[PDB]
Design a protein around this ligand. Structure first.
Ligand SMILES: O=C1NCCCCCNc2nc(c3ccccc3n2)Nc2cc1[nH]n2
Length: 280
């Protein structure tokens, strides 16, 4: 039962961003000398082998719209998750210089939807859709990241009222821990569309415990301000309190906002340029 040491298997390089449940680093697989991303989760207070088994299952996923998993390695109380590295920045990173235009939003949402359609067709739930987990390559390709595990890391805490993580993107049925399915991602997608349009999810000025309380009780958010009627309607379609009333990802790919505004992903290199200029 002697475990491989991830610090020997991988060279941890610079931090590249805050992930859910842990910081994310660029890394090198020392066996292949290939670049990877590494997220280290501290599981001192927690079923570890169930999470590793599911990461192994998810490492078999294969889609242009979803980052690869490359397994995970436990070291004492820390779980090293190994992932495909993308270097363009997350959509959250790329929101820093200023507002996105509706073509950028529609392009990014279209790619997210294709990734959600893939995961849902494989009977998986992303469960952590937010701009921070939407990644760009240096060429503008868009892939979902950190999918398929957040439920194992949070659902029990939510049941016990011991969850202290961030609630802004959670569907009401996830907060109430009733039966939830892929439609939970569709709610989170609607919140993420607001985040891409306005820079932050609804209720971002409120205490997270008030937000956890509000989401299942309040009318769902809507997109307010100078935004096109199709974009507002796309948001409204996602943000229905009843999950059976939300459309599937496959249906949303046909939404007129997506079809009339999405353009080539290669144009999103302009967004990466803006980040460079912002930080130059
Ligand atoms: O699979 C990942 N999950 C981790 C998802 C949460 C972190 C997202 N923030 C991020 N992420 C990058 C990155 C690279 C270069 C510059 C900025 C970057 N900002 N790269 C990355 C992330 C992952 N892979 N590659």
């Amino acid at each position: 039962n002697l475990k491989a040491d991830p610090e020997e298997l991988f060279t941890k390089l610079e931090k590249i961003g805050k992930g859910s449940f842990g910081e994310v680093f660029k890394g090198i697989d020392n066996r292949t000398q290939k670049v990877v991303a590494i997220k280290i989760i501290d599981l001192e207070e927690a079923e570890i082998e169930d999470i590793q088994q599911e990461i192994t299952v998810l490492s078999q996923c294969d889609s242009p719209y979803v980052t690869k998993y490359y397994g995970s390695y436990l070291k004492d109380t820390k779980l090293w998750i190994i992932m495909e590295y993308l270097g363009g920045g997350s959509a959250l990173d790329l929101l820093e210089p200023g507002p996105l235009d509706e073509t950028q939003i529609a392009t990014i949402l279209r790619e997210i939807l294709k990734g959600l359609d893939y995961l849902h067709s494989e009977k998986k739930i992303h469960r952590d859709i937010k701009a921070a987990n939407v990644l760009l390559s240096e060429h503008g390709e868009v892939k979902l990241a950190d999918f398929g595990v957040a439920g194992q890391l949070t659902d029990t805490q939510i049941k016990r009222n011991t969850f202290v993580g961030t609630p802004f993107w959670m569907a009401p049925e996830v907060i109430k821990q009733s039966a939830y399915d892929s439609k939970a991602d569709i709610w989170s997608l609607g919140i993420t569309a607001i985040e891409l349009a306005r820079g932050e999810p609804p209720h971002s000025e409120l205490h997270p415990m008030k937000v956890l309380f509000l989401i299942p009780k309040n009318n769902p958010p809507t997109l307010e301000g100078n935004y096109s009627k199709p974009l507002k309607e796309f948001v409204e379609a996602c943000l229905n309190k009843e999950p059976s009333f939300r459309p599937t990802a496959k249906e949303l790919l046909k939404h007129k906002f997506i079809l009339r505004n999405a353009k080539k992903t290669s144009y999103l290199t302009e967004l990466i340029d803006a980040h460079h200029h912002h930080h130059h």
